[PDB]
Scaffold this active site. Structure first.
Site: not given
Length: 279
Positions: A39, A69, A161, A224
């Protein structure tokens, strides 16, 4: 063990019903397992990680999470308050820059890195990789995720998403990994969650509280956020000896809460991750 006033998603993972706020789990807590968070990095100094998080690789000028994130996702895997597997070892691999973007060639390199790097770590109970990222379909990105899984790592990836079929996104569309959709606290499909036959499982993804950079916390939403619930659950179950990296996705689907989610499209699994822990 019981954690009172837990984030709703943790409580959901150990419950047959929505609407409770205590997380119940075996105290082994993923001890002896490892989860790679591929990530934007991890703010490993966050008190919530208790020294159990470390950066092992970056492809940029710093290993620091300048976004948040990756720290949020790692917190859902294994932070003391916000994590599923509160004693796992967390390894950060920074394939995304501080804007949250990364070239597919860097993402591929990071996946092949983990497949090799696990042989440099102590993970007697097994190894997991959490990939809260994706883009358009790429056979090379899917193949990288397939190799990582084949090498003995439980690979969990975000479905995406786009409120669309995950077949057109990578690594979401790779069949051999664990593709994770998102649900909300009322057991509805998250409004943004991708769907389709390639999904294996749903996890909590709307309004998920976890760690953030600057030693803080915040609540955000996405597939996520659902993916690290499943990654942490896999690590927890592997520590318990209930499953293996090769079979953990299938085991999680086999033992999931079945038929409890609403607005699941015809042809998509109605399976919500569940630890089946009996206190």
């Amino acid at each position: 063990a019981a954690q009172t006033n837990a984030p709703w998603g943790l409580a959901r993972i150990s419950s047959t019903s929505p609407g409770t706020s205590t997380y119940y789990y075996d105290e082994s807590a993923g001890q002896g397992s490892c989860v790679y968070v591929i990530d934007t990095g991890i703010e490993a100094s966050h008190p919530e990680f208790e020294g159990r998080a470390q950066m092992v690789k970056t492809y940029y000028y710093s290993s620091r999470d300048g976004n948040g994130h990756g720290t949020h996702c790692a917190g859902t895997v294994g932070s003391r308050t916000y994590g599923v597997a509160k004693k796992t070892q967390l390894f950060g691999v920074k394939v995304l820059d501080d804007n949250g973007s990364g070239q597919y060639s860097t993402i591929i390199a990071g996946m092949d890195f983990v497949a090799s790097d696990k042989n440099n770590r102590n993970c007697p109970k097994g190894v997991v990789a959490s990939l809260s990222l994706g883009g358009g379909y790429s056979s090379s990105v899917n193949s990288a995720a397939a190799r990582l899984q084949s090498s003995g790592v439980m690979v969990a990836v975000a479905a995406g998403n786009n409120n669309a079929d995950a077949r057109n996104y990578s690594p979401a569309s790779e069949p051999s990994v664990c593709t994770v959709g998102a649900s909300d606290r009322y057991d509805r499909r998250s409004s943004f969650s991708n769907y389709g036959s390639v999904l294996d499982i749903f996890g909590p993804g709307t309004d998920i509280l976890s760690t953030w950079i600057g030693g803080s916390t915040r609540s955000i939403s996405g597939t996520s956020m659902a993916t690290p619930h499943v990654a942490g659950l896999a690590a927890y179950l592997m520590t318990l000896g209930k499953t293996t990296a090769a079979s953990a996705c299938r085991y999680i689907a086999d033992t999931a809460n079945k038929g409890d989610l609403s607005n699941i499209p015809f042809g998509t699994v109605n399976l919500l991750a569940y630890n089946n822990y009996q206190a």
